[PDB]
Every structure is written in C-alpha cells, then in structure tokens.
Amino acid sequence: LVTPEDVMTISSLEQRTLNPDLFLYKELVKAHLGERAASVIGMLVALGRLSVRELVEKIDGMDVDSVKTTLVSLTQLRCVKYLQETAISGKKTTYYYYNEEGIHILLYSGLIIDEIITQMRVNDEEEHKQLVAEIVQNVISLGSLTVEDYLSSVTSDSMKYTISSLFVQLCEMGYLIQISKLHYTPIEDLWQFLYEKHYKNIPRNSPLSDLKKRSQAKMNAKTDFAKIINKPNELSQILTVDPKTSLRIVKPTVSLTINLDRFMKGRRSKQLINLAKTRVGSVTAQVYKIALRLTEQKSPKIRDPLTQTGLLQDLEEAKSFQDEAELVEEKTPGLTFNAIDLARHLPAELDLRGSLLSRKPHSASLINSHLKILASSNFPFLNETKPGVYYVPYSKLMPVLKSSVYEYVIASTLGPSAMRLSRCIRDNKLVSEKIINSTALMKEKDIRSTLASLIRYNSVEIQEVPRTADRSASRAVFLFRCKETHSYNFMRQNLEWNMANLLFKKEKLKQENSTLLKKANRDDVKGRENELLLPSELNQLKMVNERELNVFARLSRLLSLWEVFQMA
Template sequence: MAPASLSESAKTQSPSSYLYTTLASSHLGETSAIVISSLIAFGRSTPKSISSNTDLSLKQVKTALVSLVQLKCVLYWREGKEVYYTFDERGMHRLLYSGDIVIHIRSVYGNDSAQIIQNVLENGSINVKEYLSSFSEDQKYETTSKLLKLYNDGWLSRLQPHDYYPLEDVWDMLFQETLKNTPRTATTSEIKRLAEAKARTKIKLNEYLAKGTDPKDVFLVEAGMQKFHPQVTVSFNLSRYEKHLRSRALVGLVNSRFGLLTSKVYEACCSLIEQNSPDLHLPHLQISGLINDPEEERSYISSIENGLIDSKRTVFNIRDIPRALSSNIDLRNSILTQNFLKPGKRVNINGTVSVSKKVKLEDGTPQPASAEADEDLDDDSDDFVTDNADAKSISLISEHIRLLTSSSIPMLSEITPGSYTIPYMQLSKHVKQHNLNTLVKTTLGVNALRVLRCIQQMKLVDEKAISNSVLLKEKTVKNELYKLINMNLVEIQEVPRSADRAAVKTFFLFRHKPISAYRFLSDALMYDMAEILTNIARFKSDNKILLEKCDREDVKGHEEELLLESELKTLRQLQQRELLNLGRLHRVMWLQIVFGVL
C-alpha cells in the first residue's frame, strides 16, 4: 500500500485549511496534516470515519490523534462507546505563535522562564512534580519560583479535563441536565421554560469552567513557602498572550497618533491591567446559536468589561504609572504646554498684549532692558511652573494622560479623578479601521483611501456624490472604486428605477461593510502565510540532500572544512532565503492577528 499524501483539497477548501495543514505538515508530519484536513472538511468524526475518509489505516489515525490531542489541536468527546474528535484552531495558533511567545517571555522574564514556556508548548502540558524532578536541589527552588511567577502572571494555567472537551458538547450536556430538572407547568410556556433553562445553564457553564482554578486547589504552603500541589499539571494560557497582542496593537495606534513617548506611557498603562483585561474569546460567543443577535453580543461583551471596571480589576491610578515605565524613558521636554514653555509676551485678562513702558530712573536715565526682562520673568514665575527635574514626574505623565483621554478617539477613560481604565470594546474597531486605512494607503494609494473614507462616512453613496465629496475626477473615482471592489472592501448595490429593471435606468450605490471586509482580509492573509510556509518547505525539499548532510553529527561545526565551496554558497543562500521568508511571514501574521484575532 502506497503511503498516504496530503490531497489538493486540503489547500483549496479554505485558506484556514491550507494554513493549518501546511503548519501541521511541517511541525507534526504529513499524517497529522491529513487527519486535520479530514476533521476540517467533515467536522466531528470518529477514528473509523477519519480512516475511511482518508487513505490512512486506523492505527495511523489513532497514533496521530494522540499527539494532536496532547497539543490541544484536536478535542474529543465520549458518547457511550464512541469517541468523537473535533478540530480546534486555537491549538494550531499555539504552534503558529510559539516563536513569538518564547521571544516575548525571554524579553520580560529571562531565559530560564522562556525555556519553561518552550517545554510547555512542545509537550502541550507539564506535570510540575515530574518537571522539577529533572533538576538538582539547588535549581528546584529557582525553577519553582519562576513557575509560580509565570502562573501568577497568567501565562500558565492549570490543565483541567474539560480543556480537552469541545465547548459546544459541554454546553449541550449541561443544558440537557438543566432542562430535565426544569419541570413543565400549565402556567409556564415552553418558550419561557427554555429561556429559564438557558439562563441557568450559562451560570452552570461559568462554574464548570472555573472549577479547580481556586488557589487552594493549586497551591500549598510548606515551611512558609508557596508551592504547587504535586498532582498539578500546567499548560500555556493562549488567552493571556492574546491580551498582550491586543495591548501591542493599541500601543501601535497611540504611536501613530501621538508619538513614541506618549505610546510608552500608554504601554505602561496597558501593562498595569493587561492580565485582568477581558478575554478576546469569551466562552458564550464560541457556542454556535447561543448568542445570535448583534445587539445581545455587544451587551454581553460590555457587561463583562463593566463588571471588571466595577470590581476595580481593570482600573489603575496615575501614581502607578512611573513604576511601570521602562527605566530608559525620559519624559522631560516632551510636553509643549503653557506650564512647560518659556513664556512669550504677557497677556492681560481681556486678551490684549501688554506693552512694556519705558521707565526712567531717579537720575533720569532709562532702565536697562535686561532688568525689565528679569522683573517680568520673576513676575511670571508663578504662572509658568516647570517640572522637568524628574524624568518620570507625575505632572509630565498627567499631561500625556490628558492627551490620551481628550482625543477624538479616547484611548483612556477617567473613572474617578486620578483613576483610569482602557475602553477595550470601543477601541477594538478603531484599531482595525486604522490598520485597514494604512493598508489601503500603502497598497492602493492615497486616492483609494480618500474614496474609502468617503464611503465609510456617507454609508450608502453613488459615484457622483463620491466625486463631489473627495474632489476627484469621475474617471479617477471609477478607477479607485474598481480597485476597492476587487479587494472586497466596497460592495455594490443595484437600484433599479423602473419595474422592468432596465439596465439603462439602473444606477449603483456603494457601501463598506467592515465585518465582511475584515473577514476577507483575514482569509487572504492566511492564504499568504500558507504560501510562505509552502515556499520554505519547497526550497528545503529541493536541497534535502545538502541539509541532511549538514545535520550529521560529524559535520556540525565543521561545515567550512567538510563542505565544498559550491555547497557552502548554496547553504548561505538557503539561510538568507529562509530568513527573508520568515520576516515576511511575521509581517503578514501580525496583520492577520489584527483583522482575524483581535
């Protein structure tokens, strides 16, 4: 029997399928990629059905499923004697972002903590007791403290059995239990009964997901030291990294609008409440059919955010910002306001400029100009107080905060005097819109951006109105509309003027739908990422013999002595090509995160 290979349909059925199967093929092998392709195409399946849908044997399928479940790329659910498997894209996100995750942890916590995170990502999870047993007694204390720090900061979470279960199956199980315990009565309609069961199940689901995360279930205290329970197993918390990505996107928006130093102040604000900020993927929104109304969805997200504000978990004080600022930040002379500038001419209360009068001294000689200036400066010293002595003074920080709160897009909201929060829900759409406008400007040109902004502002508009608004020729507007329509950023609506819908009497209106535009961009960027990964795999395959030769133990470290000049040249070209492609991959991946994840 010939070995199974990944079918062309894995690439063509959807951009996400193309990306995830390519990623799985490079990290986990072709068998795992085939299993993932089948689960994406056919949905919830048993091992037997996966085997029948592919050319894999049942043993190969089960072997691949073990590693995929371990990495949480596939979730399972048991019903009677059957076990059903479901693909989970968040497991693939852990593989996709793994390099960036390790780099970020290394920059914040150091090499040892980065090594812990890398081990967790490679194995899916680690048992704390077994992991510490591989260290000497001297190293155990340091490693335990680093594990505790990562756990308390939210980067690690306790592994629970329900982490391997599909959320929809968990919901269905809890809902059926609640419905059984909700009796039918003559005075209660079936609709009301279902609504009551649904409301109770939501509470049960939250309790079910929070089970086992209480500190007393995770930690114990021995000799005054906090330690993990021996049976605790930890895994990487992807939601925590997504919060970091959101903060990074918000800081980028502030940087483009206010400049570098204000963005550094805002970055410090984000770091103070990042861990407690709302999750990007809320459980109720991941269950299909639970929340269908957009208004109900906004209300649910808003209630989560307002609850965190009411409990002060996402509120920070301005006096906390200096300790969160980087040590190399100097805010002196960064604010140009009345309090931080050398005054010019004095202005009277009525708004007129006061004219300096010439004063004669007792001996009849005029007063020197320098003396007059010194007196004026002394008089003005109370009006113009400078606070440039401290590089991170509260007065300087408060001026930056005032910029952030009073702009057309408020990046901060003041709760009480001196206390602020970040309106994540409101800022989410502004981040995407800013990146979309930047993308249109750099790829399609300034005129295309003007036309797009006009359509965004006027909602539904015809070609002539666009031309009059943006002050461009009709021909130019037509060309820009053609580009935007090709990119699926603008939609066309046909408006017939006659009952027979005659083409001569028909005119067209244009509109921009942000959600569909972001979805299209996300899919296009996922396809580009898959193409880059395929390109890397292809040129590695073309030079497979040379790369296998370089991987031999007797060749490692002695390449210049044992390889031919032509082989060394090819090896350098391969390394440069891979670096260029990886750079492209990370740039495209960041845009996909903005439009598809945030």
C-alpha cells in the same frame, strides 16, 4: 504568452483554489509534525466532527493503531478536541474535533518565546534568558509538562531550587493554566450539555410558561457556564498549598500547559504600542508601553467570553450581550487605576518631566496628564468614569481600531487616492456616483480606476436600483454601500492564504534540499561547517539557508496583521 505548462509550475494556481483556512493548518502540521498527521488534520478541517472509525474509513490509512497513535500525538499537540456522545441503545462512542488554538502555538512559536523572554522584569543576566527560553521551548513542544519529570531530569540541587521558582511566576502571570476538559471539548457541546439538564429537573404544572421557563433555563445555563469557565481561566489552586519548612510550590504530580490568550493580549498591546510609535512622538509614547503593561495581566476578553460561539446571541432585545460586557468592564475595579498606584512600576529611564507644555520628576500630576490626554484623544483609548481614575474600554475601541487597520492595509496595498475613496465611502454612508464627486473633488478617471480596483474585494458592496418591474442595472443608476463585515471576512482569508503559501514554499524547499538539511542538522556538522563543507555546496547551503531566514522574517512580519483581524 505564458505556457499552461509554464503556468502551474511557477504560477501556483493549483493552490489558489484551496480554502485558505485548510491550507495554512495543513501546511503547519505537515512541516512540523509529519505527513500522516497532516492528512488527519486536513480531514478534520474538512469534516468538523468524526470518530476514529470514520478516519479509518476516509483516509488511506486504515490501520486502526496508526490513526490512533497519530491522534494521541495530535491530541497532545492540542490540535484535537474530543468528547463522548452517549448512545443509549447500544455502544456509546466518541467524536474528535480540531482545536484551532492548538496550532497557533506552532504558528506563534517565535513570538511566543519572544514574549516569554522580553516581558520579564529581570533580563540583564544572560543565564536566566537561556534557561527560560529552553523551558518555554520544552513546554510548547512536549505539551503537558510535568514537574515530576522535570525535577527528576534536572541534575543539580542548586538548579532545582529555581526552576520551581519560575513555574509559579508563569502560573500566576497567566502563561501556565492547569489543563483539563476545557481545552479538549467544543463550546457548543459544553453548552448543549449544560442546556438540557436544566430542562430535565424542572417540575411540572409550574405557573410559568414556555417562554418563562426557557428564559430562566438560559439564565441558569449562563450562570453555571460562566462560573465553571471562570474557575480554571485563572486561579491559585495550583499553587495555593505551602509545604512545611519550605517555600510555596506548585503541586509536583500535576501537569502544566502554557496558555496563549495572555500572549495574544501581549501581542495586541504590542500592536497598540507600535500604533502609538507611528502616530505619537516617543516623549509621551514611552508611558503607553507600561500604561498597558500593568493592566493587561487582568485584561478582559478580546472577541468572545465563549458564550457567543456555542449558542445564538438573540433576535429581540439582542443588545443584552454587549450591554452586559460593557457593564462588567465598567463595574470591575481591577482595570481602574489611580496616579499614585502607577508610580511604583515606572522605571527611572523615563523622565516624565519634559512630556508636557502648559501653554503655547515621576510626578503624579504629570502622569495623570497623560492619562487625561489619552482619554481625551480622538481614538477612545480610555474612557473617563471618575475624575482621577479612568479605564480602557473594549466595547467601542476594537471596531474603530480594526477599521483603522483595514483602511491602512488597503491604503498600503493601493494608492493615496484609493485611500481617499475608501475613506469617503467609510465616513459617508450610502455614497453615490455624484456624492463621490461632491465629497472628493478628485479627477474622475483616477477616482474610478481606484473604484474599479476596490470593487474586486469585499470592501464596497454595490446595490442594483430597480426602476421597472424587471430588475436591470442597465437603464438606471446604481449607488454604493459599505457592508463592512464582508470586508473583515476578506482580509482574514487573503492573509491566511498568504501565510499558507509561505509555509507551502518552505516545505517545498525542504523537499528540494532534504539531504542537505538532514546533513545540516547533525551533531558533528553543527558548529563545524567551514572546513567540512566544500565551497560550492557550502555556497548552495548558505544561500538556501539565508533564503529560509528571510522567509521566516517575512512570515513573522505578516504575523502582526492577521491576528488583529481575527477579533470580532
């Protein structure tokens, strides 16, 4: 027997009852920022909207200044969205949200700098790598970075001439967007402020009706919201100026904040390249790394163009949103490319000669061969609109890709027979206790063990079959169902919980060796640890340090499976 005191000591059942979403965010903010910030962010997770008064009332910290300083620090960290709701009959106040994507920087930081380093065209010289690494760390750490301060801090004229040259590149690429109300305001509040004004300016006695005025109000709101969201998502108005007898430069007085959507697209394309690396041999797979490298820079949305979060989609004629999304994907020619255009970016190290066999040199008739084979592949990577130029769809690619990932995660966690059964339930809708044997022909004991194991999750939903006026699943048979959406809910929370646990354990280890870690992070200790540290304590420190190195590796490895599930 394991003791209840032995339990809850190494078992960690107290944390098992936390909601995974709160756990991970709280632990990230705790281990990075501090304790009061962790308390504030956890309270924000619990109560979505509240004022500074309500924080003062709800946390042990009543000191109005203290919560204020932690809130301005957290707001800088982009962890808080705010607004001002106008009380008309007295003093109008404000409310603060929590910004989910403001902590993903604290979560993706290693992948963030990895993309910033690797994705660039020139990386052979060492100095540029260190320079851009330090600049991206400074920007993601401080927050809104000001070139007015940065050039002032830089000490050499020959060195100020290139840091300004790196900012324009990040702005144009999409890693540096001017920061404004769009990153610090909630979507529903934006829409509810853009959704009643149109209902205030309409005249009276209009020969239309409530349904017609409502439809045209929704149209007007959608138009203005789409316009004002397009305006800052990508533009040249930060660097569209050009000074006399000088170079093109971003404005010196404005601030620069690093985005994350572009990095998310990079990570998603990385997952696709890894999928190809497992499935398709590297002879024709090295093309796919650049085939998506040159199209991601203007790639479309991944989950929601932000009109599907602040308002309801629809009830009747509810196909309109995906209809317009796929319609835009078809209409926009920026994503469509020909065999000639793809030639000027392909490096020589990819030969593009032996990548085909017409029976049993940087040439368009061969790269278009890979274009066509990708289009005609079983997974619709690209769709053929015109003969010669195609496009990559996201209307029907994300569902099948995510289902493949979900299936293979379940198969990696479980056995091949479990994979066979889940695939039977997937590719056969409405399976039954006999259709399993009809479509599987595997030994019943093993298949039902895998069935019972897979029931615990949200993969397989089971229906009770009513036979008499009383509903009982004890006299009649009962067949199965998929209801895949719950299955996607489940893999989000488990993985989020496990990352939360990993952050919790590293914070525990820091708590257990705070003195040692503080000694380690000292100016004189850095670089001189062999003579100073006596062998026994040095062994303890090196073992705990390699433990945390390994756990960071574990976290990064898990950082390649949950963000893909995050999509819709």
